[PDB]
């Protein structure tokens, strides 16, 4: 506090109400532009249609070819370069399948070696990719 | 609009740091000393101790000769005396803050059976509690977390429906007796 009067409540409240909008988390949480730019639209999970599989080259020093899927959503129709998490699980995902798409834990931000990928795949055609990796369940054919 | 309670509360609160070595050391010593089942058994007694110490601090923040302070202090001292952790001569609201998790775990019915000595080990006493061989005031106690009152301390003994007491023998004894009589003729 800078103005320490006995009746400066409206001054302190208006100054703090003006200065809250300069915070990065407050402005992102309270403006609808980030919610419009978010493909999930304030959602934890999202189903979508596989259309192609893309080998994305990696960033600086770590150099590899990560595996991504061009997921077209149902609730919006937007396109997401979703990430196939585990080893050898690109072969389970075929063309024109419904996959469940979640975040990656940085709240809509690219993570590590992969440029321009925010989201990943959890389930594949109502069968979980974790169980497809472990070998418990089988893909329904 | 249905007729039910919807009233519940978590009896335990997890610590802020998950992998403190000294904290795991102290909790592991507590479990290995008093025969516990998990860390939740430590944490729920820690949270009841947190309740009692928070009530004690809320009383010490009050002024002396306040009627609410005197009534709540006398009631809390009566509760500590009847659970038998704090002594009947020691009872004052300033001595509540100097009380410990070990003295709270001493009043476990598992630990009290181990101290009276009718069971061999602490976990064997827990086996007896699970298998319903002991009773308290003509009432079978199946759960080892029974806080035994000081007035109800001396009534701990074996139950009536118990082969270790005055009752019918168990399934293994009946099966061995039947097998022996079948082998004899």
């Amino acid at each position: 506090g800078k103005c320490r009067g006995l009746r400066t409540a409206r001054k302190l409240r208006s100054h703090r109400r003006d200065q809250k909008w300069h915070d990065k988390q407050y402005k992102k949480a309270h403006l609808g532009t980030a919610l419009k730019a978010n493909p999930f639209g304030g959602a934890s999970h999202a189903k979508g249609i596989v259309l192609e599989k893309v080998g994305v080259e990696a960033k600086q020093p770590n150099s590899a070819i990560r595996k991504c899927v061009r997921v077209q959503l149902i609730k919006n129709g937007k396109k997401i370069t979703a990430f196939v998490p585990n080893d050898g699980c690109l072969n389970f995902i075929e063309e024109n399948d419904e996959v469940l798409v979640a975040g990656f834990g940085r709240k809509g931000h690219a993570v590590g070696d992969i440029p321009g990928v925010r989201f990943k795949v959890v389930k594949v055609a109502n069968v979980s990719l974790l169980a497809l990796y472990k070998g418990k369940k089988e893909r329904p054919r | 609009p249905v007729a039910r309670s919807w009233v519940c509360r978590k009896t335990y609160v997890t610590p802020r740091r998950p992998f403190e070595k000294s904290r795991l050391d102290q909790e592991l010593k507590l479990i290995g000393e008093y025969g516990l089942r998990n860390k939740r058994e430590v944490w729920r007694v820690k949270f009841t101790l947190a309740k009692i110490r928070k009530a004690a601090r809320e009383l010490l923040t009050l002024d002396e000769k306040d009627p609410r302070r005197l009534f709540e202090g006398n009631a809390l001292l009566r509760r500590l005396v009847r659970i038998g952790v704090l002594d009947e001569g020691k009872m004052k609201l300033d001595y509540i803050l100097g009380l410990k998790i070990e003295d709270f775990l001493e009043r476990r019915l598992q630990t009290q059976v181990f101290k009276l000595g009718l069971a061999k080990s602490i976990h064997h006493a827990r086996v007896l509690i699970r298998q319903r061989h002991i009773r308290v005031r003509k009432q079978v106690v199946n759960i080892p977390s029974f806080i035994v009152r000081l007035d109800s301390q001396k009534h701990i003994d074996f139950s009536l429906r118990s082969p270790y007491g005055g009752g019918r023998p168990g399934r293994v004894k009946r099966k061995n007796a039947k097998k022996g009589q079948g082998g004899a003729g």
Binding site: K53, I65, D87, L90, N91 | L28, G32, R37, N38, H123
Partner: protein
């Protein structure tokens, strides 16, 4: 290229899992943990070795 998917997972040697006696669980597991931590060992000089320490 996407032709090398599952390469190492395919070409590693499949080792079968060894059959093992079932572990005690719950209060008995924590009791056996307490017994292997405290009451067995003695205070020794130097740096104490870890539980999974091997040479």
């Amino acid at each position: 290229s996407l032709a090398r998917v599952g390469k190492v997972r395919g070409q590693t040697l499949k080792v079968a899992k060894q059959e093992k006696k079932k572990k005690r669980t719950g209060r008995a597991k924590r009791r056996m943990q307490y017994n292997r931590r405290f009451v067995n060992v003695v205070p020794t000089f130097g740096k104490k070795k870890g539980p999974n320490a091997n040479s």
